[PDB]
Structures are given as structure tokens and as C-alpha cells.
Structure 1
Amino acid sequence: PQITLWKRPLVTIKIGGQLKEALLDTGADDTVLEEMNLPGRWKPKMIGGIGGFIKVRQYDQILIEICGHKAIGTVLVGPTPVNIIGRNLLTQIGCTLNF
């Protein structure tokens, strides 16, 4: 689809069989989701944002479905204020900016 930005570009995603709302975020290198249980192994990681750094759990090769498009890649889980879909997955679904 084509999405304008008069409001936040929120979309429904599916991860681990659960539905969630997430923000299509061109300003994020990485994808960061609020605290949740995911299968598979995980390793601690740090990521930095506008206000500083937070501790996250890095899950690799996780399947996520974004508006019906499938992606499999790195998902960070931690105390982010909003579920954000970053460029690592936006590229997998073929997302571009246009103006």
C-alpha cells in the first residue's frame, strides 16, 4: 500500500502467533518490541535512542508478518515505549520513502 503520515504509521503485525500494533519507523536501524515471551535462544544487547540506551533481548531469525508481508530477521525485545519496525525488516518487505 501507500501510507501518508498525517497520523502515526501504525500497522498490525503477527509475531509468535500473536497480533500486535507496531510503528513503521524509517528512523530506526533495528526492530524493537515491548516485553514479551518469544521462543528460541536470546542474548543480551543494548540499543540507543533519543533519550539514551536500554537493555534488550536479541532474538535472531524471527518470523514477523507485517500487513501480510513476511519477514524473518532480528527482533529486539525490551522496555521500548512503542513497538517499532526498523529498517532491518522494512527492507525485507520492500518498503521505500517517496515524495
Structure 2
Amino acid sequence: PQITLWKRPLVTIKIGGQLKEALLDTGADDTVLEEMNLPGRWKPKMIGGIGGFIKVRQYDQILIEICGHKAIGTVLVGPTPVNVIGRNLLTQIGCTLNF
């Protein structure tokens, strides 16, 4: 679909079997979700944002459905202000910017 930007581009995602709401974020290299329980191994990682760095749990090769489009990739879980879908998954569902 074509998504305009007058409102936040929030979409429904399915991850770990649970539905969540997330922001399509072209300024994010990586996908970062708020604290949740996810099945699978994870490793400690750090990521930097506008205000500095935070600690996250890095889950690899996670299945995630974004508006019905399937992606399988890295998901970071930690104290982000909002769930963000980053370019690592936006590229998998074929997302481009157009103007």
C-alpha cells in the first residue's frame, strides 16, 4: 500500500504470535521493540539513538509479519520509547520512499 505521513505510520505487526503496534521508521537501521517476552536465544547488545545508548536483547532470525508481509530477521528488545520497524525489515517487505 501507499502510506502518507500526515499521521505517524503506525502498523499492526505479529511477532511471537502476538499482535503489536509499531512505527515504520526509515531513520532506524534496526528494529527495536519495547520490553516483551520472545522465545529463542538472545545476546546482550547496545544501540545508540538520539539521546545516547541503551542495552537491548538481540534476537536473531525472528519471524515477524508487518501488515501481512512476512519478514525474518534481527529484532532488538529494550527500553525504546516506541516499537520501531527499521530498514533491516523494511527492505524485506519491499518498502521504498517515493516523492
TM range (shorter): over 0.9
C-alpha distance in 1 between matches for 2:41 and 2:12:
25
C-alpha distance in 2 between matches for 1:49 and 1:23:
15
Tell me, which stretches of 5 or more residues in structure 1 are unaligned? none
| Equivalences for residues 1-99 of structure 1 within 5 A | 1-99=1-99
C-alpha distance in 1 between matches for 2:83 and 2:4:
19
TM-score (norm 1): 0.99
C-alpha distance in 1 between matches for 2:20 and 2:86:
15
Q: Report the CA distance between 1:52 and its aligned residue.
A: 0.6
Q: Report the CA distance between 1:63 and its aligned residue.
A: 0.2
> Per the alignment, in what secondary structure is the counterpart of residue 5 of structure 1?
coil
C-alpha distance in 1 between matches for 2:65 and 2:41:
20
C-alpha distance in 2 between matches for 1:50 and 1:40:
29
TM-score (norm 2): 0.99
How many percent identity over aligned positions? 99
* 1:34-59, Cα deviation, whole Å (9 max, x unpaired): 00010110000000000110000000
C-alpha distance in 1 between matches for 2:44 and 2:90:
23
* 1:49-87, Cα deviation, whole Å (9 max, x unpaired): 001100000000000000000000000000001000000
* 1:11-39, Cα deviation, whole Å (9 max, x unpaired): 00000000000000000000000000101
> Per the alignment, in what secondary structure is the counterpart of residue 88 of structure 1?
helix
> Per the alignment, in what secondary structure is the counterpart of residue 37 of structure 1?
coil
Structure 1 runs (4+) deviating above 4 angstroms are none
> Per the alignment, in what secondary structure is the counterpart of residue 13 of structure 2?
strand
C-alpha distance in 1 between matches for 2:14 and 2:81:
19
